[PDB]
C-alpha cells in the first residue's frame, strides 16, 4: 500500500526524479496538517460503530425492500454481512484518511468489490446509499458537526480532511 | 443442501409465510410415502455397483469408439474415472431420492459438471447415454422390475419415486 | 439446511458413500417424529399472530425501559419492528419444526444475529424474554400434544440458547 509520501515518491519515480520542491512542500503541508489528520481519524474511529449502524439503518429505512424477503438485508446473516461490509468500508476509508492516499482502500477493499457484489446479488444502489450516508456522517464527525456527539478539538478548518473523506467515499461508490 | 421439507420452507420463506396447510399436507404425504422412499433408496444403493457397471458397459457397447484409441473410455485410467464419475452421479441421484429434492444433486455434482466435462473432453452424448441407462436400471430397481434382481418389498405403487429418480437423471442429463 | 436428511446425506457425501442402513434409519426417525413436528408447526402457523403479540407484550412488560428514548422500543416504528422480529423468529421456528432441524433458524435468524443486535443496540434479553414467555405459555394438551410441545419448546429453547 501507499501513503501520501509514498504516492509522491511513486509519482516522482515515474520520471526518475528526486522528489521536487513542490512535492516536498506539499508533504510538509501534509505533516503540518498531520495533527488535524489524526484529529479526523480519531473522530471517525471513535464513532465507527455509530457511523456504520446509522448508515445501514438509514439505507434500510429509505428502502424497506432490503429487509423484505428476497431483500439483501433480510436474514440476520445478511444483515450482519451488511453491517460488516459497512464497517470494513469505513475502516479502509479511515486507513486512506490516515495515510492521505486511497491506495489502501482501492487495493484492499474496492479491488474486486463490484464484481463480488454483483455475483452475490448485493444491490449497488443500496450499497452506494449506505456508503453515502457513511460519507455524510464521517464528514460531520471530521467537522465536529454531528448533532448528538461532539468531540473536543482546537478551533480550526478541517474542510480539506472532510473533502478527503468524501473523496474516499466517492471512490468507494464509483468502484461499485 | 436442501431436502423436500427444506425446499418447502425455502419456498415459504420467499413469501415470508408460515408453512401453509397445502405445503404441510404435501410434506405429510412425503412422510407417509417415506417407507416407500427408503425402500427405493435401498433398491438403488443395494445394486449401485451393478447399475453403474451395466450403464458404463452399455454406453461403451453402443459407442465402441469410446474404448478405441483417442476414445474417452480407452486407458483403464479413463475407464476407472468413467466408472467413478458414473458412481458419483448415481450417488448424488440417490441422495436426491432420499432427500426428495434435487438441490444436493445440482449443487454438489451438476454445478460445473458440463464445463468440467467440456474441459476434459468427456463426450456429453456418451455421458448422457450412461446416465440414461442408469436412469432405466434405477427405475427398474425402484419398481422391482429389474430382470436380474427382486428386492422383497410390500406390494404397492412406487411409480412416484420412480418418476422422481427419472427426473433426477433427466436433470443430470440436461445439466451436461 | 440442518436436518436429519441433510445431516446424514452430508456425512455420506463427505465420506463419498451411498446412503447406508444408518442413513435410512435416520430418515425413518424423521418419519416418526414428523407427526409431532408438523402438528406443532401447523398450530404455530395457524395461531402465530396471537403468539407473536403475546411474546412482544411480555417482552415490553418485562423490560419497560425499552420504551425510553435511545432504547430499542423508543418508537412505535421499532416496537412494530420488535413484533416483526418476534414474528420472524416464530416463522423460523415453524420452519425448523417443518424441516426437522435447526437449519432455518441457524441460517436465517441466529447466524449474525449477535453482531446485528450489538450494532443496533438490541438487548438479547428482550428476545429471550419473549421466547421464554412463549415457551412457558404453551399448555398441554390445550395448545398442542405433548410431543408437539416438546418440539416447539425445543425450538424455542434453541433460540434462547443462541441468544444467551
Amino acid at each position, epitope marked *: 500500500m501507499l501513503d501520501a509520501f509514498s504516492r509522491v515518491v511513486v509519482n516522482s519515480d515515474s520520471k526518475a526524479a528526486y522528489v521536487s520542491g513542490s512535492d516536498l512542500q506539499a508533504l510538509k503541508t501534509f505533516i503540518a496538517d498531520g495533527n488535524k489528520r489524526l484529529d479526523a481519524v480519531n473522530s471517525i474511529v471513535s464513532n465507527a460503530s455509530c457511523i456504520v449502524s446509522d448508515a445501514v439503518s438509514g439505507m434500510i429505512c429509505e428502502n424497506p425492500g432490503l429487509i423484505a424477503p428476497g431483500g439483501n438485508c433480510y436474514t440476520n446473516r445478511r444483515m450482519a454481512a451488511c453491517l460488516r461490509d459497512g464497517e470494513i468500508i469505513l475502516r479502509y476509508t479511515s486507513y486512506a484518511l490516515l495515510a492521505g492516499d486511497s491506495s489502501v482502500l482501492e487495493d484492499r477493499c474496492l479491488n474486486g468489490l463490484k464484481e463480488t457484489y454483483i455475483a452475490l446479488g448485493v444491490p449497488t444502489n443500496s450499497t452506494a446509499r449506505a456508503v453515502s450516508i457513511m460519507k455524510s456522517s464521517a464528514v460531520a464527525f471530521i467537522s465536529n458537526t454531528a448533532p448528538q456527539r461532539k468531540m473536543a478539538t482546537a478551533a480550526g478548518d478541517c474542510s480539506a480532511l472532510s473533502s478527503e473523506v468524501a473523496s474516499y467515499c466517492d471512490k468507494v461508490s464509483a468502484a461499485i | 443442501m436442501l431436502d423436500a421439507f427444506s425446499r418447502v420452507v425455502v419456498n415459504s420463506d420467499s413469501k415470508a409465510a408460515y408453512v401453509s396447510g397445502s405445503d404441510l399436507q404435501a410434506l405429510k404425504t412425503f412422510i407417509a410415502d417415506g417407507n416407500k422412499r427408503l425402500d427405493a433408496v435401498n433398491s438403488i444403493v443395494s445394486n449401485a455397483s451393478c447399475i453403474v457397471s451395466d450403464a458404463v458397459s452399455g454406453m461403451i457397447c453402443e459407442n465402441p469408439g469410446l474404448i478405441a484409441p483417442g476414445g474417452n473410455c480407452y486407458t483403464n485410467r479413463r475407464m476407472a474415472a468413467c466408472l467413478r464419475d458414473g458412481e458419483i452421479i448415481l450417488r448424488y441421484t440417490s441422495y436426491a431420492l432420499l432427500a426428495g429434492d434435487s438441490s444436493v444433486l445440482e449443487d454438489r455434482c451438476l454445478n460445473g459438471l458440463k464445463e468440467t466435462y467440456i474441459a476434459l473432453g468427456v463426450p456429453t452424448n456418451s455421458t448422457a447415454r450412461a446416465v440414461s441407462i442408469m436412469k432405466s436400471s434405477a427405475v427398474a430397481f425402484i419398481s422391482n422390475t429389474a430382470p436380474q434382481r427382486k428386492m422383497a418389498t410390500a406390494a404397492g405403487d412406487c411409480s412416484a419415486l420412480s418418476s422422481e429418480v427419472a427426473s433426477y437423471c433427466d436433470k443430470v442429463s440436461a445439466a451436461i | 439446511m440442518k436436518s436429519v436428511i441433510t445431516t446424514t446425506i452430508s456425512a455420506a457425501d463427505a465420506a463419498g458413500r451411498f446412503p447406508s442402513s444408518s442413513d435410512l434409519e435416520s430418515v425413518q426417525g424423521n418419519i416418526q417424529r414428523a407427526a409431532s413436528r408438523l402438528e406443532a408447526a401447523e398450530k404455530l402457523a395457524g395461531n402465530h399472530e396471537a403468539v407473536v403479540k403475546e411474546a412482544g407484550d411480555a417482552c415490553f412488560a418485562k423490560y419497560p425501559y425499552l420504551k425510553n428514548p435511545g432504547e430499542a422500543g423508543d418508537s412505535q416504528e421499532k416496537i*412494530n419492528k420488535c413484533y416483526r422480529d418476534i414474528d420472524h423468529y416464530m416463522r423460523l421456528i415453524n420452519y425448523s419444526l417443518v424441516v426437522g432441524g435447526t437449519g432455518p433458524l441457524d441460517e436465517w435468524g441466529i447466524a449474525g444475529a449477535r453482531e446485528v443486535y450489538r450494532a443496533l443496540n438490541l438487548p438479547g434479553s428482550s428476545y429471550i424474554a419473549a421466547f421464554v414467555f412463549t415457551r412457558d405459555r404453551l399448555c398441554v394438551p390445550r395448545d398442542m400434544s405433548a410431543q408437539a410441545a416438546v418440539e416447539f419448546s425445543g425450538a424455542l429453547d434453541y433460540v434462547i440458547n443462541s441468544l444467551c
Partner: T-cell receptor
Amino acid sequence: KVTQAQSSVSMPVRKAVTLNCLYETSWWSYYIFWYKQLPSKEMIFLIRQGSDEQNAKSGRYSVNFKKAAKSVALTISALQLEDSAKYFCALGAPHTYWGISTDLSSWDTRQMFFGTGIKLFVEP
Amino acid sequence: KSVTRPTRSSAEITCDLTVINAFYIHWYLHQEGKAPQRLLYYDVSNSKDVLESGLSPGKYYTHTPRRWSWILILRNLIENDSGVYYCATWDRPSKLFGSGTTLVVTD
C-alpha cells in the same frame, strides 16, 4: 376506511375546533395522518398519530386518539385567520412491518386511505 | 396546476416531487367531493404500474422524462376522469405530496 361524518364546520379566530374523524381498520399497528388541503389544493401534512403512541401534539395542532373507540379527532387550538382549509383524516400504515395482510409489499406500496374531508371556515 | 384536455384524448400529469431516493410514486385523485384515492403507484426501481383491483390496464401509465421525474398518462379521457391528481411518496414522518394538478376533461 376513514369516515369523516361532518364537513364545513365553522369556528371563530383564536378558538379551538375539534375535527371528529373515525376510521375502520384491521391493522394491529397503524398511523393516522391529518392533512389540510389549501385553496391551492396543496395537501399539507399537519400531525402524525400512531395506533401505539401517546396522543400526538404539534404545538397548535393536537390529537385526542382512541384505540377502542377509534376516535383520532384532531384538535386545532388558537386558530389564526389563515387556517381555513379542507382537513383530511388520513389512515395509513407506512412505518409498520407487522400486523397487516400477508402480501409481499414493503409498505412503500401501501396506500393512504382518506376521509371525504372536513372544510374549516375561520370566521373572525 | 391545471390541465384541460378533450374527451377521448391524452392528459399529462407532471408534478414537483423533488424526492431523490424514491422507490414508489403513488398517484392520488381527489375528485372534489369524495376522498383522495389512489389509482396506481409507480414502482420506480422496476418501472411497473400497479392498478388497483377492478380496473383495466392501459388506462394509466407513469412516464419518466428525466431522472427523478414522473408523469401520469391518461388514455381515452372521459369526464369521470376529471379531478385533482397528486404524486405521493412516503416520507419519514408522513407521505409527501406534490402541489397537485387539476385535470378537467371537457367534451
